[PDB]
């Protein structure tokens, strides 16, 4: 009735719960006290990619009043960003369909 | 998507079958939601006969919308579609 | 039900379906094979064409782009049944109206 | 507050069909099913948590409560349970699916049998607009023809050969097909392997044959994990979306189908009520799911734990579809067959509202005329929604009531859920109360548009829109002209009466479907009603050349013509 | 207030057929906006007129006509430099209830961006200032500088059922006030 | 349902007046609102079957709010009797006075008679001008006052 | 019509059908729907019989067109009326 | 009992379906760049091959000139392959692959610059480490940097003079070399385009047949191969010229871009010598860790020359691409070196005196007796083809150090007993259920229960055998194999997709924490975070930092683990 079947090692308070670990869980032992090295090193990670984003290579941008108000008349520009054309490139290691963005 | 003008228009004159019965029962369902009726019932009650009636006083306010397979369509009213 | 004793129903079966369909009368056909068959009042999901409850999409947790429309439960139960195997039959909707 | 909210009519334009990976299982489930017992005698055979049956999934019977929607077996959807798997196992459905894809690539390092620049051309093709079943057939066909052909594949050459099923449902593929008079490194670490393996034992020579390489479900999911997003097109399986994975078409997650699904019946031979096939079959595969976790942190005999992994991949087999030596219904089974789920409910069905009785002939109805009997005109009804053009008749109507056929048996309120029963509560009130947008069911009466349909059904005339007139004897009474379309004889035959419910249906019946307006046979365009035997003999009989009437007799011949 | 054009479809039941179909649509489309906020639009009053009145469409089982149609509709949309009198109706030490005659009266007025003097007591006090204070329902006057429209709804059935059982961001648009400069507060400090 | 565009056309506060004004002559009616009808409509669900629910609610608090008389201090309604002719014969002041900013549905319907006010609606005020343009405005708008 | 003799059994039918369901309702259900699985399968629901499985209306007979109410709006009650105050704050620039 | 919305929210048992190939790629170019470049790389690893109009019709973008954007910022971060195919027949357009090894430099940037750093023999002086940092990282977040604008940015000559000067250090080095055409084409359409032009240059009617004919075809095209290759992966044609009364100049007008290969020799010279510190004392495990010094400079090709990678390997006498490894690795006079050579670049501080026993001052005797040990030594580190000179040979370290950080990686995860079943199913061939009783003599239940446990993964291979010609397991025993290929593959998903998580973990608390980061990272608050700031607020900030603090170190211990793997 497929409840006869039982090997001689396996008991039977073991089986019938089952659901098993919601994470299987094993520590690693790459998470090891921290070092001055190892802490300078996440500094720099930390410093880079947020190097690339305050600079011009985001391309991922997908108060909007229609009046503006007279603070906003002679008020500082948030940041005149360096556009992707602005940007020098070299002509040779692009495609020709990718010229007509730059400013030639 | 393009509605081809009242103009020009290369579909039959005739209403069919199809068209015949599907207004009589739009008609009827309409009348049967309580909306006015612009025909003499002389006593009848039944929305489709109501409806037949209409459709023979050709005074149904409804227009076919005939979608040809290239996507587009033309209308024709009621009244201008002959039987 | 099937029977006179149980007060079943006459079945409509194929033949009288393709009979029905040869004269072209397509809301007798959803008259007599859904609407006084079986109509179901189910609530799908428009990210994601699965059916929920209680206008829960309770797969995307959000209920958003739950809508609701009659099916046969024919066609609920045979959705079900996929999902039971390895068979997802999503939905995908679009208006009747905005021409 | 009060915030907008938006409704748009909508309709299906089309289904995805695909697999429900793992995370799409648990995603959609919402209780996980653990325990292999349904009921415990602890609790007096009630359905608890983490069961077969468990309450969260639904409820098999009307005076119960989901916990996940807590609606009662008319308004509980049915909510999935999702089971987990140590272990994996095949799929049944995806076998040849399974069969195909570990064609494709090779199983020593997960890379595809084809060239990087090779059916790249064909790929391009695959994008051709006008692409139809049979081309996409014809091209995965050639695909996997050209991927059958290439034995070395360019990330490592192994010789893959062939990848066919157990002479069972194990797979074994033939690393050393193609092999002859040739002499590799691998074939020399091969050697030396079986060498060690012949220098101890006094008996595998002769077992040493066959024992190719087999592909276990375990060693394939873990080689199916290992494939890259960029060979899934080749595969035929777009991963621009979750799912798309091939891993995901192995049987990691069980989706336990929903109470609504399979249905326990109640109060079946011993006063318990009894289950079913799909529920004992789960129960089963949760058992064996929950031992085979068990072996894993005791360390049983791996040819014993061999049994019980090999009977899940048997057990599975026949719930999906029991096609292994037999009368286990498996879901392929509910699916499959004349009484199966597509041909018995889905084009095809039993339909309220419809009668059928014996049917007489009736030379003094009309043609386009059906006579009904008044016993079943009382109990089939037409749902007439109050009018400002119909309201005094149907108080009429439903003071009359359901006892008398003019009447009517049921009112559904406009502004109320469940209709009223017209037995009891005083139906001059409600007579007097109707409003204008009340739907009375009343009953059949002279003039209603009826289906009226004889089987089989051969072609479209076999069934015709009929008008009802009410009559008091207990036959569906039809003129005789119109027993041709239907082949009817009057000797027993019995005919199908049904009463289309909506105003559109309704219209379309007797429009399209009419008697009148099918006195042609559309596949010739000839009449096909028209007088019957007696009809032509009699007019044959006036007709005679020998016929004289004086004037009286004339006359009366005409008043009964008309 | 601004207006602002809608896109909408609007159903049409066959009882109101007889009325004129300009009237008809305006009443759809009132009973669908009548007090109704627009998620992240704003609040709306009523539908001031009608554009695109496309012919309307049937679909082959209400007999209802669905009508396309785009029209101008009067949103109460303050933007930075607006100025109001609102009347307040509650208040609690977190920053005053400001509430309106009914139209919409769950906005709320930090105190830090408030007179900075002004603190709140446990021994309910009025107000405390280095001058003048003012009490309860009484004329008031501030900004707005900031919007932010509450468009989560998370919400499971079953603990829907639970809260019914027993039985938060009522609003999807909000206000806040300011009164930096002097003389906001109050129409009637001097003069 | 998907809103066009947020930004239309601006209001000036007394164009929504007759606007609003317009609505309740034209129908909702509140001095017939608060007579009773035992018959009412007789058709089922009020006078032809209609009624204006959570209508008419928005299309009175607003009215109401503006016929309470404008906050320039502690008799009119305040927008009631200003003409079109009205607001019409005074372009020469309101055009020719400049401001570079749409801010004038402001001072239209709130705040005369102090120049703290003009202050607040348009700011940095006293910077652009403080010399004798800071007066003339307030009596104007103030000259239906 | 397709360029070859296609018959009227289980293997003629897949001839540019793609639509599983009408498939299945006409002759070996588990296997299409199976292979529709894997292959991820897209077919829209434009058959009668998949429109009459899934409560849709087909699109033959009194479905093959579409019934239209004419609003009988005029234009010139269609047109933004009574707007002065954007021109005002136009002209003031 | 664990909820199932429970779950999937904490248990992120929906990110376990990710291939790690397409998710850890995704993800980097989400975290650095933006999320429609991001979709513009998964959709490239998704599908492959494609144009610009697959895009527009595969994705949520369909704007042409804003996937034009997306799509020249991926390729100048080197993300990105094109390649412009010709229909004869009509108009051409290109197609588009990704680079795998430059995002690299996304994710390496932290240990390139940390190497950079370390590396250099001046480093005390702070100035000079400060400003190669700051030119490694403008360099790597520029991609091809030029002197051209920098010279002209800097603002002091003398300044100025530095830059030029150490550029010409790092194209020697080999951290800059001079891209080209060869950075952004697949290698298999390279080698089909050196492959049929060879076909079509040969005149009809030859004595010869097929066979011979793509015999010389094929050995024609991997000449010119490897010519075209080896003419730009070492060079110094930029930076040659020299002008009148000045110092060496570079190519001002051309783009430099930072290498990688030259960088991943250093890394792999570091974990082996990572590897003989925990191997060996640091008496002669100080000496070896500037023994591979010399030679990692100019050291051969990790796993493939690209002659490997753009075409099939062979089908018959396959052996020759090993051979011909081997034999350069031979051939190749430069890597080897004598102990004369090895005594010039000692550095002052090891001795080398109390290092040798013989018996139970930079003297070429001795260090040439830690190249003999090291020779002799039970891992081949190095080979003796005469008297003196030695070399590295990689024709057998490769397998023999891919088992060894396997297997260890095994017994990290595991039990000593799971450790020494994998063993002997290591070296001994083809066990069975009881060569494993003859072999381990250990407790055979938890052998066995370790041996579940390891079942799970790519670990060992399972068989079945027929007793019968029907092929059932559970009617006869069966036995096990090695099948050490598929263990190799696991290390890459498992650990592609732990990398993948930790940075989808760094990004959802950068989701989660973006005001608060916003208001960290500004110009007048950094440097002066604990004054203008809440208690509570502040707190918050600091042990969120913490937080990434911590998940950039584990991060920083997990790159570790998948370089080695990704060899052949
Ligand atoms: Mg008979
Ligand atoms: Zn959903
Ligand atoms: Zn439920
Ligand atoms: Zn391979």
């Given at each position: 009735?497929?409840?006869?079947?039982?090997?001689?090692?396996?008991?039977?308070?073991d089986?019938?719960?089952?659901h098993?670990?919601?994470?299987?869980?094993?520590?690693?032992?790459?998470?090891?006290?921290?070092?001055?090295?190892?802490?300078?090193?996440?500094?720099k990670?930390?410093?880079?990619?947020?190097?690339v984003?305050?600079?011009?290579?985001?391309?991922?941008?997908?108060?909007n009043?229609?009046?503006?108000?007279?603070?906003?008349?002679?008020?500082?520009k948030?940041?005149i960003?360096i556009?992707?054309?602005?940007?020098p490139?070299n002509?040779?290691?692009?495609?020709?369909?990718?010229?007509?963005?730059?400013?030639? | 998507?393009?509605?081809?003008?009242?103009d020009?228009?290369?579909?039959?004159?005739?209403?069919?079958?199809?068209?015949?019965?599907?207004?009589?029962?739009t008609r009827?369902?309409?009348?049967?939601m309580?909306?006015?009726?612009?025909?003499?019932?002389?006593?009848?009650?039944?929305?489709?006969?109501?409806?037949?009636?209409?459709?023979?006083?050709?005074?149904?306010?409804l227009?076919?919308?005939?979608?040809?397979p290239?996507?587009?369509?033309?209308?024709?009213?009621?009244?201008?579609?002959?039987? | 039900?099937?029977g006179?004793?149980?007060?079943?129903?006459?079945?409509?079966?194929?033949?009288?379906?393709?009979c029905?369909?040869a004269?072209?009368?397509?809301?007798?056909?959803?008259?007599?094979?859904?609407?006084?068959?079986?109509?179901?009042?189910?609530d799908?999901?428009?990210?994601?064409?699965?059916?929920?409850?209680?206008?829960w999409?309770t797969?995307?947790?959000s209920?958003?782009?739950?809508?609701?429309?009659?099916?046969?439960?024919?066609?609920?139960?045979?959705?079900?049944?996929?999902?039971?195997?390895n068979?997802?039959?999503?939905?995908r909707?679009?208006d009747?109206?905005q021409? | 507050?009060?915030?907008?909210?938006?409704?748009?009519p909508?309709?299906?334009?089309?289904?995805?069909?695909?697999?429900?990976?793992?995370?799409?299982?648990?995603?959609?489930?919402?209780?996980?099913v653990?325990?292999?017992?349904?009921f415990?005698l602890?609790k007096?055979?009630?359905?608890?948590?983490?069961?077969?049956?468990?309450?969260?999934?639904?409820?098999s019977?009307?005076?119960?409560?989901?916990?996940?929607?807590?609606?009662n077996?008319?308004?509980?959807?049915?909510?999935?349970?999702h089971?987990?798997l140590?272990?994996?196992?095949?799929?049944?459905?995806?076998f040849?699916?399974?069969?195909?894809?570990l064609?494709?690539?090779?199983?020593?390092?997960?890379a595809?049998?084809?060239?990087?620049?090779?059916?790249?051309?064909?790929?391009?093709?695959?994008?051709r607009?006008?692409?139809?079943?049979?081309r996409?057939?014809?091209?995965?066909k050639?695909?996997?023809?050209?991927?059958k052909?290439?034995?070395?594949?360019?990330?490592?050459?192994?010789?893959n050969?062939?990848?066919?099923?157990?002479?069972?449902?194990?797979?074994?593929?033939?690393?050393?097909?193609?092999?002859?008079?040739?002499?590799?490194?691998?074939?020399?670490?091969?050697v030396?392997?079986?060498?060690?393996?012949?220098?101890?034992?006094?008996?595998?020579?002769?077992?040493?044959?066959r024992?190719?390489?087999?592909?276990?479900?375990?060693?394939?999911?873990?080689?199916?994990?290992?494939?890259?997003?960029?060979?899934?097109?080749?595969?035929?399986i777009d991963?621009?979306?979750?799912?798309?994975?091939?891993?995901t078409?192995?049987?990691?997650?069980?989706?336990?189908?929903?109470?609504?699904?399979?249905?326990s019946v109640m109060?079946?031979?011993?006063?318990?009520?009894?289950?079913?096939?799909?529920?004992?079959?789960?129960?089963?595969?949760?058992?064996?799911s929950?031992?085979?976790?068990?072996?894993?942190?005791?360390?049983?005999?791996?040819?014993?734990?061999?049994?019980?992994w090999?009977?899940?991949?048997?057990?599975?087999?026949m719930?999906?579809?029991?096609?292994?030596?037999?009368?286990?219904?498996?879901?392929?089974?509910?699916?499959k067959?004349?009484?199966?789920?597509?041909?018995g409910?889905?084009?095809?069905?039993?339909?309220?509202?419809?009668?059928?009785?014996?049917?007489?002939?009736?030379?003094?109805?009309?043609?386009?005329?059906?006579?009904?009997?008044?016993?079943?005109?009382?109990?089939?009804?037409?749902?007439?929604?109050?009018?400002?053009?119909?309201?005094?008749?149907?108080?009429?109507?439903?003071?009359?009531?359901?006892?008398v056929?003019?009447?009517?048996?049921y009112?559904?309120k406009?502004?109320?859920?469940?209709?009223?029963?017209?037995?009891?509560?005083?139906?001059?009130?409600?007579?007097?109360?109707?409003?204008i947008?009340?739907?009375?069911?009343?009953?059949?009466?002279?003039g209603?548009?009826?289906?009226?349909?004889?089987?089989?059904?051969?072609?479209?005339?076999?069934?015709?829109?009929?008008?009802?007139?009410?009559?008091?004897?207990?036959?569906?009474?039809?003129?005789?002209c119109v027993?041709?379309?239907?082949?009817?004889?009057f000797?027993?035959?019995?005919?199908?009466?049904?009463?289309?419910?909506?105003?559109?249906?309704?219209?379309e019946?007797?429009?399209?479907?009419?008697?009148?307006?099918?006195?042609?046979?559309?596949?010739?365009?000839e009449?096909?009603?028209?007088?019957?035997?007696?009809?032509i003999?009699?007019?044959?009989?006036?007709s005679?050349?020998?016929?004289?009437?004086?004037?009286?007799t004339?006359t009366?011949?005409?008043?009964?013509?008309? | 207030?601004?207006?602002?054009?809608?896109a909408?479809?609007?159903?049409?039941?066959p009882?109101?057929?007889?009325?004129?179909?300009?009237?008809?649509?305006?009443?759809?489309?009132?009973?669908?906006?009548?007090?109704?906020?627009?998620?992240?639009?704003?609040?709306?009053?009523?539908?001031?007129?009608?554009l695109?009145?496309?012919?309307?469409?049937?679909?082959?089982?209400?007999?209802?006509?669905?009508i396309?149609?785009?029209?101008?509709?009067?949103?109460?949309?303050?933007?930075?430099?607006?100025?109001?009198?609102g009347?307040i109706?509650?208040?609690?030490?977190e920053?005053?209830?400001?509430?309106?005659l009914?139209?919409?009266?769950?906005?709320?007025?930090?105190?830090?961006?408030?007179?900075?003097?002004?603190?709140?007591?446990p021994?309910?006090?009025?107000?405390?200032?280095?001058?003048?204070?003012?009490?309860?329902?009484?004329?008031?006057?501030?900004?707005?500088?900031?919007?932010?429209?509450?468009?989560?709804?998370?919400?499971?059935?079953?603990?829907?059922?639970?809260?019914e059982?027993?039985?938060?961001?009522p609003?999807?648009?909000?206000?806040?006030?300011?009164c930096?400069?002097?003389?906001?507060g109050?129409?009637?400090?001097?003069? | 349902?998907?809103?066009?565009?947020?930004?239309?056309?601006?209001?000036?506060?007394?164009?929504?007046?007759?606007?609003?004004?317009?609505?309740?002559?034209?129908?909702?009616?509140?001095?017939?609102?608060?007579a009773?009808?035992?018959?009412?409509?007789?058709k089922?669900?009020?006078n032809?079957?209609?009624?204006?629910?959570?209508?008419?609610?928005?299309?009175?608090?607003?009215?109401?709010?503006?016929?309470?008389?404008?906050?320039?201090?502690?008799?009119?309604?305040?927008?009631?009797?200003?003409?079109?002719?009205?607001?019409?014969e005074?372009?020469?002041?309101?055009?020719?006075?400049?401001?570079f900013?749409?801010?004038?549905?402001?001072?239209?319907?709130?705040?005369?008679?102090?120049?703290?006010h003009?202050?607040?609606i348009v700011?940095?005020?006293?910077?652009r001008?403080?010399?004798?343009?800071?007066?003339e405005?307030?009596?104007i708008?103030?000259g239906?006052? | 019509?397709?360029?070859?003799?296609?018959?009227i059994t289980?293997?003629?039918?897949?001839?540019?059908?793609?639509?599983?369901?009408?498939?299945?309702?006409?002759?070996?259900?588990?296997?299409?729907?199976?292979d529709?699985?894997?292959?991820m399968?897209?077919?829209?629901?434009?058959?009668?019989?998949?429109?009459?499985?899934?409560?849709?209306?087909?699109?033959?007979?009194?479905?093959?067109?579409?019934?239209?109410?004419?609003?009988?709006?005029?234009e010139?009650?269609?047109?933004?009326?009574?707007?002065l105050?954007?021109?005002?704050?136009?002209?003031?620039? | 009992?664990?909820?199932?919305?429970?779950?999937?929210?904490?248990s992120?048992?929906?990110?376990?379906?990710?291939?790690?190939?397409?998710?850890?790629?995704?993800?980097?170019?989400?975290?650095?760049?933006?999320?429609?470049?991001?979709?513009?790389?998964?959709?490239?690893?998704?599908?492959?091959?494609?144009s610009?109009r697959?895009?527009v019709?595969?994705?949520?973008?369909?704007?042409?000139?804003?996937?034009?954007?997306?799509?020249?910022?991926?390729?100048?971060?080197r993300?990105?392959?094109?390649?412009?195919?010709?229909?004869?027949?009509?108009?051409?357009?290109?197609?588009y692959?990704?680079?795998?090894?430059?995002?690299?430099?996304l994710?390496?940037?932290?240990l390139?610059?940390?190497?950079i750093?370390?590396?250099?023999?001046?480093?005390?002086?702070?100035?000079?480490?400060?400003?190669?940092?700051?030119?490694?990282?403008?360099?790597?977040s520029?991609?091809?940097?030029?002197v051209?604008?920098?010279?002209?940015?800097?603002?002091?000559?003398?300044?100025?003079?530095?830059?030029?000067?150490?550029?010409?250090?790092?194209?020697?080095m080999?951290?800059?070399?001079?891209?080209?055409?060869?950075?952004?084409?697949?290698?298999?359409?390279?080698?089909?385009?050196?492959?049929?032009?060879?076909?079509?240059?040969?005149?009809?009617n030859?004595?010869?047949?097929?066979?011979?004919?793509?015999?010389?075809?094929?050995?024609?095209?991997?000449?010119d191969?490897?010519?075209?290759?080896?003419?730009?992966?070492?060079?110094?044609?930029?930076?040659?010229?020299?002008?009148?009364?000045?110092?060496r100049?570079?190519?001002?007008?051309?783009?430099?871009t930072?290498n990688?290969?030259?960088?991943?020799?250093?890394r792999?010279?570091?974990?082996?010598?990572?590897?003989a510190?925990?191997?060996?004392?640091?008496?002669?495990?100080?000496?070896?860790?500037?023994?591979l010094?010399?030679?990692?400079?100019?050291?051969?090709?990790?796993?493939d020359?690209?002659?490997?990678?753009?075409?099939?390997q062979?089908?018959?006498?396959?052996?020759?691409?090993?051979?011909?490894?081997?034999?350069?690795?031979?051939?190749?006079?430069?890597?080897?070196?004598?102990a004369?050579?090895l005594?010039?670049?000692?550095?002052?501080?090891?001795?080398?005196r109390?290092?040798?026993?013989?018996?139970?001052?930079?003297?070429?005797?001795?260090?040439?007796?830690?190249?003999?040990?090291?020779?002799?030594?039970?891992?081949?580190?190095?080979?003796?083809?005469?008297?003196?000179?030695?070399?590295?040979?990689?024709?057998?370290?490769?397998?023999?150090?891919?088992?060894?950080?396997?297997?260890?990686?095994?017994?990290?995860?595991?039990?000593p007993?799971?450790?020494?079943?994998?063993?002997?199913?290591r070296?001994?061939?083809?066990?069975?259920?009881?060569?494993?009783?003859?072999?381990?003599?250990?407790?055979?239940?938890?052998?066995?229960?370790?041996?579940?446990?390891?079942?799970?993964?790519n670990?060992?291979?399972?068989?079945?055998?027929?007793?019968?010609?029907?092929?059932?397991?559970?009617?006869?025993?069966?036995?096990?194999?090695?099948?050490?290929?598929?263990?190799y593959?696991?290390?890459?998903?498992?650990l592609?997709?732990?990398?993948?998580?930790?940075?989808?973990?760094?990004?959802?608390?950068?989701?989660?924490?973006?005001?608060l980061?916003?208001?960290?990272?500004?110009?007048?608050?950094?440097?002066?975070?604990?004054?203008?700031?809440?208690?509570?607020?502040?707190?918050?900030l600091?042990?969120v930092?913490?937080?990434?603090?911590?998940?950039?170190?584990?991060?920083?211990?997990?790159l570790?683990?998948?370089?080695?793997?990704?060899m052949?």
């Amino acid at each position: 009735n497929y409840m006869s079947n039982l090997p001689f090692g396996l008991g039977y308070g073991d089986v019938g719960k089952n659901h098993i670990t919601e994470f299987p869980s094993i520590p690693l032992p790459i998470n090891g006290p921290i070092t001055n090295k190892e802490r300078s090193l996440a500094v720099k990670y930390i410093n880079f990619g947020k190097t690339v984003k305050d600079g011009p290579f985001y391309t991922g941008s997908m108060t909007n009043d229609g009046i503006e108000r007279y603070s906003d008349k002679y008020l500082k520009k948030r940041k005149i960003g360096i556009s992707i054309d602005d940007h020098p490139y070299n002509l040779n290691l692009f495609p020709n369909e990718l010229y007509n963005v730059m400013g030639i | 998507e393009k509605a081809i003008p009242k103009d020009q228009r290369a579909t039959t004159p005739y209403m069919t079958k199809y068209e015949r019965a599907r207004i009589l029962g739009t008609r009827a369902l309409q009348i049967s939601m309580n909306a006015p009726v612009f025909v003499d019932l002389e006593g009848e009650t039944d929305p489709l006969r109501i409806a037949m009636k209409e459709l023979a006083e050709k005074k149904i306010p409804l227009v076919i919308r005939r979608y040809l397979p290239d996507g587009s369509f033309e209308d024709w009213s009621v009244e201008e579609l002959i039987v | 039900t099937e029977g006179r004793s149980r007060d079943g129903g006459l079945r409509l079966g194929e033949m009288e379906r393709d009979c029905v369909i040869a004269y072209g009368a397509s809301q007798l056909l959803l008259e007599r094979l859904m609407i006084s068959s079986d109509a179901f009042e189910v609530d799908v999901c428009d990210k994601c064409g699965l059916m929920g409850y209680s206008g829960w999409c309770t797969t995307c947790k959000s209920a958003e782009n739950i809508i609701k429309m009659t099916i046969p439960y024919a066609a609920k139960l045979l959705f079900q049944e996929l999902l039971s195997m390895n068979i997802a039959p999503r939905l995908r909707l679009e208006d009747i109206f905005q021409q | 507050k009060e915030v907008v909210v938006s409704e748009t009519p909508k309709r299906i334009k089309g289904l995805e069909f695909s697999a429900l990976s793992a995370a799409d299982i648990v995603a959609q489930s919402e209780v996980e099913v653990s325990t292999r017992d349904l009921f415990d005698l602890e609790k007096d055979r009630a359905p608890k948590a983490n069961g077969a049956l468990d309450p969260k999934m639904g409820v098999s019977s009307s005076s119960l409560e989901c916990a996940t929607c807590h609606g009662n077996l008319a308004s509980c959807h049915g909510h999935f349970g999702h089971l987990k798997l140590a272990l994996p196992v095949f799929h049944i459905g995806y076998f040849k699916a399974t069969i195909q894809i570990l064609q494709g690539i090779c199983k020593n390092c997960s890379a595809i049998l084809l060239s990087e620049t090779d059916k790249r051309q064909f790929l391009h093709e695959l994008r051709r607009p006008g692409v139809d079943n049979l081309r996409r057939m014809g091209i995965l066909k050639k695909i996997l023809d050209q991927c059958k052909k290439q034995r070395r594949c360019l990330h490592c050459g192994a010789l893959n050969g062939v990848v066919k099923k157990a002479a069972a449902l194990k797979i074994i593929h033939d690393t050393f097909r193609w092999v002859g008079k040739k002499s590799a490194p691998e074939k020399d670490i091969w050697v030396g392997e079986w060498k060690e393996v012949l220098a101890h034992n006094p008996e595998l020579e002769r077992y040493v044959k066959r024992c190719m390489d087999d592909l276990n479900p375990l060693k394939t999911l873990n080689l199916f994990k290992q494939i890259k997003s960029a060979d899934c097109e080749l595969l035929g399986i777009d991963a621009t979306v979750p799912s798309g994975r091939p891993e995901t078409y192995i049987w990691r997650y069980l989706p336990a189908p929903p109470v609504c699904i399979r249905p326990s019946v109640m109060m079946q031979d011993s006063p318990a009520s009894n289950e079913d096939d799909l529920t004992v079959k789960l129960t089963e595969i949760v058992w064996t799911s929950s031992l085979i976790k068990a072996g894993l942190d005791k360390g049983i005999s791996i040819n014993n734990m061999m049994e019980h992994w090999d009977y899940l991949q048997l057990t599975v087999a026949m719930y999906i579809n029991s096609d292994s030596v037999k009368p286990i219904r498996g879901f392929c089974q509910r699916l499959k067959g004349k009484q199966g789920r597509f041909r018995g409910n889905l084009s095809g069905k039993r339909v309220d509202f419809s009668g059928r009785t014996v049917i007489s002939p009736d030379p003094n109805l009309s043609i386009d005329e059906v006579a009904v009997p008044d016993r079943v005109a009382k109990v089939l009804t037409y749902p007439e929604k109050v009018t400002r053009y119909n309201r005094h008749k149907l108080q009429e109507l439903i003071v009359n009531g359901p006892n008398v056929h003019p009447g009517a048996n049921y009112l559904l309120k406009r502004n109320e859920d469940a209709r009223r029963n017209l037995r009891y509560g005083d139906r001059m009130k409600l007579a007097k109360n109707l409003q204008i947008g009340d739907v009375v069911e009343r009953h059949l009466e002279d003039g209603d548009v009826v289906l009226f349909n004889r089987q089989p059904s051969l072609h479209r005339l076999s069934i015709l829109s009929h008008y009802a007139k009410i009559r008091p004897w207990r036959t569906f009474r039809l003129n005789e002209c119109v027993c041709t379309p239907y082949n009817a004889d009057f000797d027993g035959d019995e005919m199908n009466l049904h009463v289309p419910q909506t105003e559109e249906a309704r219209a379309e019946a007797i429009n399209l479907m009419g008697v009148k307006n099918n006195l042609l046979t559309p596949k010739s365009g000839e009449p096909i009603i028209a007088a019957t035997q007696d009809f032509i003999t009699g007019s044959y009989l006036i007709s005679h050349k020998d016929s004289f009437y004086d004037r009286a007799t004339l006359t009366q011949l005409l008043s009964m013509m008309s | 207030f601004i207006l602002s054009k809608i896109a909408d479809l609007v159903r049409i039941p066959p009882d109101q057929f007889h009325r004129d179909t300009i009237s008809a649509i305006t009443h759809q489309l009132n009973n669908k906006f009548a007090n109704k906020i627009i998620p992240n639009v704003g609040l709306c009053i009523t539908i001031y007129d009608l554009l695109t009145v496309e012919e309307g469409q049937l679909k082959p089982g209400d007999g209802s006509s669905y009508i396309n149609v785009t029209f101008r509709a009067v949103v109460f949309k303050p933007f930075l430099g607006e100025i109001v009198t609102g009347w307040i109706s509650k208040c609690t030490a977190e920053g005053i209830k400001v509430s309106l005659l009914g139209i919409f009266d769950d906005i709320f007025i930090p105190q830090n961006m408030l007179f900075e003097g002004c603190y709140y007591t446990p021994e309910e006090s009025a107000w405390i200032w280095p001058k003048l204070y003012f009490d309860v329902n009484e004329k008031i006057r501030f900004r707005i500088e900031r919007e932010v429209f509450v468009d989560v709804k998370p919400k499971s059935p079953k603990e829907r059922e639970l809260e019914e059982r027993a039985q938060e961001k009522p609003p999807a648009y909000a206000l806040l006030g300011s009164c930096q400069t002097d003389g906001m507060g109050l129409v009637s400090w001097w003069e | 349902m998907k809103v066009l565009e947020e930004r239309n056309a601006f209001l000036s506060d007394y164009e929504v007046l007759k606007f609003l004004t317009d609505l309740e002559k034209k129908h909702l009616w509140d001095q017939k609102s608060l007579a009773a009808l035992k018959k009412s409509r007789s058709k089922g669900k009020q006078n032809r079957p209609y009624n204006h629910p959570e209508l008419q609610g928005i299309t009175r608090n607003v009215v109401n709010y503006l016929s309470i008389n404008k906050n320039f201090i502690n008799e009119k309604s305040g927008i009631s009797k200003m003409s079109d002719e009205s607001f019409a014969e005074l372009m020469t002041k309101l055009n020719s006075f400049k401001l570079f900013k749409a801010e004038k549905l402001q001072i239209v319907n709130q705040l005369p008679a102090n120049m703290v006010h003009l202050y607040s609606i348009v700011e940095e005020c006293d910077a652009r001008f403080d010399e004798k343009t800071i007066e003339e405005m307030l009596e104007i708008i103030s000259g239906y006052a | 019509y397709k360029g070859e003799v296609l018959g009227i059994t289980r293997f003629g039918l897949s001839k540019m059908r793609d639509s599983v369901l009408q498939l299945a309702s006409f002759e070996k259900t588990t296997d299409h729907l199976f292979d529709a699985a894997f292959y991820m399968k897209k077919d829209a629901v434009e058959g009668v019989s998949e429109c009459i499985i899934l409560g849709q209306t087909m699109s033959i007979g009194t479905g093959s067109f579409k019934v239209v109410k004419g609003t009988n709006i005029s234009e010139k009650d269609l047109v933004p009326k009574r707007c002065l105050f954007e021109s005002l704050s136009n002209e003031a620039a | 009992l664990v909820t199932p919305e429970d779950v999937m929210t904490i248990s992120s048992l929906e990110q376990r379906t990710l291939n790690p190939d397409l998710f850890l790629y995704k993800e980097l170019v989400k975290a650095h760049l933006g999320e429609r470049a991001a979709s513009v790389i998964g959709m490239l690893v998704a599908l492959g091959r494609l144009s610009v109009r697959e895009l527009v019709e595969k994705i949520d973008g369909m704007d042409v000139d804003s996937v034009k954007t997306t799509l020249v910022s991926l390729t100048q971060l080197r993300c990105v392959k094109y390649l412009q195919e010709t229909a004869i027949s009509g108009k051409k357009t290109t197609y588009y692959y990704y680079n795998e090894e430059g995002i690299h430099i996304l994710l390496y940037s932290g240990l390139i610059i940390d190497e950079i750093i370390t590396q250099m023999r001046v480093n005390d002086e702070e100035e000079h480490k400060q400003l190669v940092a700051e030119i490694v990282q403008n360099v790597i977040s520029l991609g091809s940097l030029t002197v051209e604008d920098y010279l002209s940015s800097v603002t002091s000559d003398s300044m100025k003079y530095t830059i030029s000067s150490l550029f010409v250090q790092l194209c020697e080095m080999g951290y800059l070399i001079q891209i080209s055409k060869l950075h952004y084409t697949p290698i298999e359409d390279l080698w089909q385009f050196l492959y049929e032009k060879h076909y079509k240059n040969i005149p009809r009617n030859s004595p010869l047949s097929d066979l011979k004919k793509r015999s010389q075809a094929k050995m024609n095209a991997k000449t010119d191969f490897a010519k075209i290759i080896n003419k730009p992966n070492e060079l110094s044609q930029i930076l040659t010229v020299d002008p009148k009364t000045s110092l060496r100049i570079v190519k001002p007008t051309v783009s430099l871009t930072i290498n990688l290969d030259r960088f991943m020799k250093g890394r792999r010279s570091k974990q082996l010598i990572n590897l003989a510190k925990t191997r060996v004392g640091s008496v002669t495990a100080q000496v070896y860790k500037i023994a591979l010094r010399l030679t990692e400079q100019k050291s051969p090709k990790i796993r493939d020359p690209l002659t490997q990678t753009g075409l099939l390997q062979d089908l018959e006498e396959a052996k020759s691409f090993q051979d011909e490894a081997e034999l350069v690795e031979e051939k190749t006079p430069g890597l080897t070196f004598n102990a004369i050579d090895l005594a010039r670049h000692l550095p002052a501080e090891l001795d080398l005196r109390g290092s040798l026993l013989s018996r139970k001052p930079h003297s070429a005797s001795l260090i040439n007796s830690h190249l003999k040990i090291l020779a002799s030594s039970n891992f081949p580190f190095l080979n003796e083809t005469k008297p003196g000179v030695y070399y590295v040979p990689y024709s057998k370290l490769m397998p023999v150090l891919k088992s060894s950080v396997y297997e260890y990686v095994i017994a990290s995860t595991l039990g000593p007993s799971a450790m020494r079943l994998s063993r002997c199913i290591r070296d001994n061939k083809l066990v069975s259920e009881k060569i494993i009783n003859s072999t381990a003599l250990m407790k055979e239940k938890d052998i066995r229960s370790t041996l579940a446990s390891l079942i799970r993964y790519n670990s060992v291979e399972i068989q079945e055998v027929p007793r019968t010609a029907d092929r059932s397991a559970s009617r006869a025993v069966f036995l096990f194999r090695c099948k050490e290929t598929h263990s190799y593959n696991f290390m890459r998903q498992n650990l592609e997709w732990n990398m993948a998580n930790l940075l989808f973990k760094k990004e959802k608390l950068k989701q989660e924490n973006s005001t608060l980061l916003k208001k960290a990272n500004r110009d007048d608050v950094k440097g002066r975070e604990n004054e203008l700031l809440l208690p509570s607020e502040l707190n918050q900030l600091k042990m969120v930092n913490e937080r990434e603090l911590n998940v950039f170190a584990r991060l920083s211990r997990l790159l570790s683990l998948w370089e080695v793997f990704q060899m052949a």
